[PDB]
Amino acid sequence: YSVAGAPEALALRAGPPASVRAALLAARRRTLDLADDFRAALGDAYPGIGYAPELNPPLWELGHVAWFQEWWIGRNRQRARGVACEPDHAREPSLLPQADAWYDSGRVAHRTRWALPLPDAEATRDYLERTLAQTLALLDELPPDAHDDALYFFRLVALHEAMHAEAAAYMAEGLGIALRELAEDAELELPAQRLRMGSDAGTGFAFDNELLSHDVSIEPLRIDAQAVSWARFLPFVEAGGYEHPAWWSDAGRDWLARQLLRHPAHLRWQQRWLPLDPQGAAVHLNAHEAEAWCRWAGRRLPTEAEWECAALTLPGFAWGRVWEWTSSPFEPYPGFAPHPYRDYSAPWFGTRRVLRGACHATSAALAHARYRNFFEPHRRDIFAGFRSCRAP
């Protein structure tokens, strides 16, 4: 197997305190640059945006990033236990008396996030600064040979902040807000093989949904070297694909029948409102649109196992442009146990479909071939496309 991601991704999961320190600083630089893009569009108006289920207010997101970090580092009396931390132990107070009432994504009702008496953008930035200074001071106590358990929460809060940065990017694109921050097609042979799927014990940090690592059989197939381009996608649309319900699943038909425009999201072709680049990865497609293109092409989505296997074994397999829908429902691997952030994976099994890879807005520190992204199969706001495969 190849390495599962860029050096930053390996360093954050497996590196020493100095690596996790550099990752926390890089995550915060990215968070504040995105906060600045939002400030340019919304001028620190709270809430700053209308309500939708796929959104949160930008100043709520910033306070939530600080709250999460503080919850799992400075207030956490069992950091050294890593995944054996008792999630509901008695914690020190927050810097902010109402932090738990405002920012705990497990406690605060979604619509309520538009109607909280939050601190202003300046005070929210002050809370971020104070919490990070506390986190880094505690990290600087760890020795260079610190165990995975000792580093566990520092790695977890860096990855969480990466996730919220990407969310800022896809929410910005949804709100039409501008931020500062394909090659030739080919088909690859994936031979019959055994994949050790997921994250092995002592490879460093693993998300709970990556465990247990377990051997799976991979059937021989032929797989796209890169995500499906607009050039490869649009011939399905021009062949009447969004008016032939027979290409679609039952869930897809129900989705399709409920659509005003019988063509992709953000395509008027133009996009966003600039002209459409056929060489760009098809993006803002849901699972139903990806599967219907597959049936039309006589191809299919990979399973996440086929995807992971290809990503780790085939040097011509190029990813990281768009998240890629798999055929795999988000379900536990054998031996799954929720980690101390209990609600990260476990509540979302069944109702979510797995996407693999990463998109242009994913942090280099998060983007990883074992990482399981999970969204309801209708979602289009995410930077999602797909690749296709078929029998050998």
Nearest of 264, 304, 298 to residue 281 by alpha carbon: 264
CA neighbor of 366 nearest in space, from 329, 330, 323: 323
Decide whether 156 or 355 has the Cβ nearer to Fe ion. 156
Between 31 and 328, name the residue whose CB sits nearer to Fe ion.
31
* Residue 247: closest CA among 298, 281, 182: 298
For the CB of residue 299, give the shortest distance to Fe ion in the complex, in Å: 35
Q: In angstroms, give the least distance from the CB of 293 to Fe ion.
A: 32
Q: Which listed range, 72-80, 100-108, 115-123, 218-226, lies at the site for Fe ion (CB under 5 A)?
A: 100-108
Q: Closer CB to Fe ion, residue 24 or residue 287?
A: 24
Query: Which stretches of 198-319 are DSSP H helices?
Result: 230-238, 250-257, 287-297, 304-313
CB of 330 to Fe ion, least distance (A): 17
Rounded to whole angstroms, how far apart are CA atoms 135 and 72?
Answer: 9
Cβ atoms < 10 Å from Cβ of 192: 10
- The site map against Fe ion for 103-122 (x = CB under 5 A) is --x-----------------
Which run of H or of E encompasses 204?
none
Q: Which is nearer to Fe ion, 78 or 105 (CB)?
A: 105
The window from 38-46, 99-107, 145-153, 289-297 that contacts Fe ion (CB under 5 A) reads 99-107
What is the DSSP annotation of 147-198?
-HHHHHHHHHHHHHHHHHHHHHHHHHHHTT----------EEEE-SEEEEES
Residue whose tokens read 């092995």: 200
Q: Which is nearer to Fe ion, 105 or 313 (CB)?
A: 105
Which residue has the closest beta carbon to Fe ion?
105
Q: Are 321 and 359 in contact (CB under 8 A)?
A: yes
Please answer whether residues 230 and 327 qualify as being in contact, where contact means their C-beta atoms are separated by less than 8 angstroms: no
Stretch that binds Fe ion, among 55-63, 102-110, 228-236, 254-262 (CB under 5 A): 102-110
Closer residue to Fe ion in complex, CB, 343/376: 343
CB of 343 to Fe ion, least distance (A): 10
- Tell me, by CB under 5 A, how many residues bind Fe ion: 1
Looking at the Cβ atoms of 62 and 305, the one nearer to Fe ion is 62
The least distance separating Fe ion from the CB of residue 165, rounded to whole angstroms, comes to 11
User: Can you tell me the distance from the alpha carbon of 285 to that of 159, in angstroms, rounded to the nearest whole number?
Assistant: 25
Q: Segment near Fe ion (CB under 5 A), from 101-109, 139-147, 277-285, 369-377?
A: 101-109
Which residues are near Fe ion by CB under 5 A? 105
